[PDB]
Design a protein around this nucleic acid. Structure first.
Lengths: 71, 67, 110, 94
RNA sequence: GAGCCGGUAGCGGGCGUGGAUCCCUGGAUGUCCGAAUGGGGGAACCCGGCCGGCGGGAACGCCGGUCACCGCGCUUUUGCGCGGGGGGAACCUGGGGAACUGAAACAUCUCAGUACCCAGAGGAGAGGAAAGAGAAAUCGACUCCCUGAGUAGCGGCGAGCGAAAGGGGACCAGCCUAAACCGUCCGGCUUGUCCGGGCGGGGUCGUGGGGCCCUCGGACACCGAAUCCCCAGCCUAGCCGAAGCUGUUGGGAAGCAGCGCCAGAGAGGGUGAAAGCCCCGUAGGCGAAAGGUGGGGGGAUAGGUGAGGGUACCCGAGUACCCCGUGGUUCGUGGAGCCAUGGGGGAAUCUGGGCGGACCACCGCCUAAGGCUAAGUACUCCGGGUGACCGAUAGCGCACCAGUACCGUGAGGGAAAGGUGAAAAGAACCCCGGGAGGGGAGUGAAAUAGAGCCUGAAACCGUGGGCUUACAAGCAGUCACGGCC
RNA sequence: GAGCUGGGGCUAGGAGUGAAAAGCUAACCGAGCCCGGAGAUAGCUGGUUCUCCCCGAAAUGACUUUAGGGUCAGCCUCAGG
RNA sequence: GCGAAUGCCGGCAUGAGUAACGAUAAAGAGGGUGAGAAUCCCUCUCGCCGUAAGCCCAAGGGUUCCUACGCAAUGGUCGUCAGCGUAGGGUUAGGCGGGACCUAAGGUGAAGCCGAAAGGCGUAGCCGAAGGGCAGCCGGUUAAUAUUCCGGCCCUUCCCGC
RNA sequence: GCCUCUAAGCACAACCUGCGGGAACCCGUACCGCAAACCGACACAGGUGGGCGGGUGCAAGAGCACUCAGGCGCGCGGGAG
């Protein structure tokens, strides 16, 4: 591993697709899109005591950095 | 030579040292023999080896006891 | 006939055989009971070597096979072998006792 | 482990002549350092190690009934004397 | 218990009843490779730095003890002392994850979360005390079996796919931690009264915990190894242990015959052709050890559990929850719920909050966003045993110098050959011959049992004999008859 | 001479290259070779084994991405009435 | 329980004693050794190479090379011949080569950047070349190896000292 | 390698230079080796890297024709034709 989160796990899976709708509107589901993909967050940082970083990931980030900001 | 087992029991540092060393040399003698007396030799070879082997078994036992 | 045995040098009888005339069992193995009763061999009409007289034909052929020999013979011939009752401090004495008896006491004879 | 001995003389013919006037040839623990030769040599036969050279040989062509092989490893090394001393009996011998 | 120097028996030499061969349990170096790690490297081989040693001293060079890397916690000093890693036939958890074929096309669908790449804990993990079930004012951990219907149902509602509570069964410990409040304390910042981290009481099992007031309270409970001692089950060595001989046809007998025999042990094999009484330490029963493993049964070791009301409350998770983007699930898009997460929003302390019915009004339910493990189904490397399971072209391909020969660059493929005889007595010796090999002698019960040598047939080629055949056209044959023998 | 050549290397097999025809890619890669799904699938061909006894088919109908296939109709056989 | 499936495995047949012997670079004699020699040994006539059918280093092969016995298998028959079978012996170098040194491409990789995982990328230092660099040659001796052995002649660095 | 300074020692015992003394290990050669021993499953006339390539003659020359050394006579034979 080398890109999950830092403040927990948000690094993985995704199966999905579509095709089309038109249901409780006029009929059944134009059904189909057998597709697969990724799905994730972002990066950023601050300072320990003169010289630092963070890295981490998104939200978990914001709350967190706040947290150790507390110290 | 369970008796030899005994002598064994008996000696210690430099003792067993040169004992097994010299004895070893003895078997060398044998090595040399590899084409002379031969016939009654046989045993000097097999046994002698077993003997010196013991020599080592002991050194191990003793100095092992030590460290 | 296994890692364990019957009589040893011993001296015993030949039931199903051709001789029956028991006698000195010169040697008996551990596994193949292979025992030589010194009671029926041949010559192996030897090599033609000077190994045997330069004019050879070995004589003492004696490898005894079959195991229908009636081992042990006290004042009694065909008898199985008992075991012990020890009797003395540290006493195996798996001597042979049945009807007559024989244990091959280390004395007068095997 | 440390049983100095490490050899078997070169009962070899051709090798004879050397034994004959100043050098001597033998089979040695396939491994001994050449300086190893010098030492085993020196303390073993109380001599004067001079010129210590080495060669090696494995076996080729031994048919064994239903399968085959050709042998192991025989090591050769030759060392010469300084005066022509030691090895006496051995040499008068073969 | 008295013989052994493994399969080689042969040569040439041996050790041993003052427990030798050997069966077992713990011993010692234990070459070099291989995770390799002192360094490098086409592994199994070449380099090097520290103390010891010896040698011709120094240079050389060996035994030696020596010196990755990782993360990990501690003395964050100068860091010394721990951990992993490397495997493993199948079972196993999660990680990621596919066409065929079906749907007689085939794009939803299908095989399927199946094959396979991976990471990893084990000896088995998995799951494992309920924001459960389910609606009766009912149940009560988790797992696996039978049943639950192949119904309830999911769907180009098509091929198809397909539950769950209950009930029967088996197996039945439950246990915990931050959860500011307590006080303690050290560090704090900066000083008063915030945070930080150690000790705790609190350390929620089916709901309280803390702090104030009063009733309180003065011996039975063991863990998931808390832990130790044992009969330690075994490991491999142990031991006994039932009763016949005479004859007799036979090369043989254990067989036909005679009489005499055993039996809580007529399971079987083995002793020259088919034995309870002959070989077998077996069925008979019993045996046994100072090591390496524990459930039991019991002890002790017992951390830690084990009260009543009152009172303003503060005290299990950083996201529940709701928008869309998705996984599960018997759900394939739908009125579609609950758990589960990728995006954005974005909180409640027991009037709390998800859960039964999309949703709203009810009752009811459970108590979430931490932690631990036993026990019952799986698996088969390895051991034991049994087989209207196999006989050498079936069986593992593989019954014994087959995963080796040999093909392929590597990946990788992947044979064949089981038996002479009862025992070696398996062939002295004579004779043709370079040899093989061939006639004799001996073997012996046989050698048409003779070394690839049991039983040893078909095919094909051969030596001799019978009939038959040179004016003959026909698969074959074959009905007839005549000539031979 | 965009010459030829030994040694040492990197790119590779739904990718490589490629003075590019669809070339060569361990001796026949128009999409490699070994093992695996798997014994894919096979209305098509082959092949489909002792004796004897009874009967005796059709080789047409109907719709079919079927049309050398198939569901139901027509003919057959064994059993009851 | 089976002809039968250009079946599966193993035999055994068939053209066939014809096609074929691997190069049109030819060979003939004498004596020899032999159980037997077109097909081995000497020696004598003779043709073809010679710019190769030369020698030489290297590669790669890894036995074998030799000396001595032997030929039932093997050579595409021979065969008392062998690179065949059996046994024994055979190559040794401070100065030749390669490491005990250098490095490119180039692989590794302490750092570092980076993946659902396995990895991707990688400075530095290292590994990594008949590309770098380095100290000898010639004459003689074995069945057999050589500037490695012997000998003559010419050096090489590193250590102890002075 | 020649220098060219820190480190820092050196400098009194570091380097440059003579003579004496003493050292120097690891793995390598046999032979085949433009080819019956290396690669094509064969004693397969195919391929496979560098060293003058002896001599005569030819204008020149690794081509030519005969040869030097050195290498052969291909390995199944005789026979009429």
């Amino acid at each position: 591993m080398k890109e999950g989160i830092h403040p927990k796990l948000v690094p993985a899976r995704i199966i999905c697709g579509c095709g089309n709708v038109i249901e409780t509107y006029s009929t059944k589901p134009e059904i189909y899109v057998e597709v697969c993909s990724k799905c994730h967050p972002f990066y950023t940082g601050q300072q320990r005591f003169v010289d630092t970083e963070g890295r981490v990931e998104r939200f978990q980030r914001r709350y967190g950095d706040s947290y150790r900001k507390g110290r | 030579m369970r008796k030899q087992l005994e002598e064994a029991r008996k000696l210690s540092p430099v003792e067993l040292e040169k004992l097994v060393r010299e004895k070893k040399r003895e078997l060398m003698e044998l090595r040399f023999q590899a084409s002379i007396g031969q016939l009654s030799q046989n045993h000097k070879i097999r046994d002698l080896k077993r003997q010196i082997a013991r020599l080592l078994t002991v050194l191990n036992e003793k100095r092992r006891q030590n460290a | 006939m296994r890692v364990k045995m019957h009589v040893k040098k011993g001296d015993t009888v030949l039931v199903a055989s051709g001789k029956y005339k028991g006698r000195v069992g010169k040697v008996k193995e551990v596994l193949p009971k292979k025992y030589a009763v010194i009671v029926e061999g041949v010559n192996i009409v030897k090599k033609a070597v000077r190994v045997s007289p330069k004019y050879p034909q070995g004589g003492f052929i004696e490898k005894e096979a079959p195991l229908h020999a009636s081992k042990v013979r006290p004042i009694c011939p065909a008898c199985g072998k008992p075991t012990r009752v020890r009797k003395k401090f540290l006493e195996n004495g798996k001597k042979i006792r049945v009807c007559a008896k024989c244990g091959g006491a280390l004395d007068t004879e095997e | 482990t440390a049983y100095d001995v490490i050899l078997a003389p070169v009962l070899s013919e051709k090798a004879y002549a050397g034994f004959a006037e100043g050098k001597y040839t033998f089979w040695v623990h396939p491994k001994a350092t050449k300086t190893e030769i010098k030492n085993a040599v020196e303390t073993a036969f109380k001599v004067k190690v001079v010129k210590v050279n080495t060669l090696h040989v494995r076996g080729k062509k031994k048919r064994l009934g239903r399968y085959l092989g050709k042998r192991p490893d025989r090591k050769k090394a030759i060392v010469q004397v300084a005066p022509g001393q030691k090895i006496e009996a051995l040499e008068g011998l073969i």
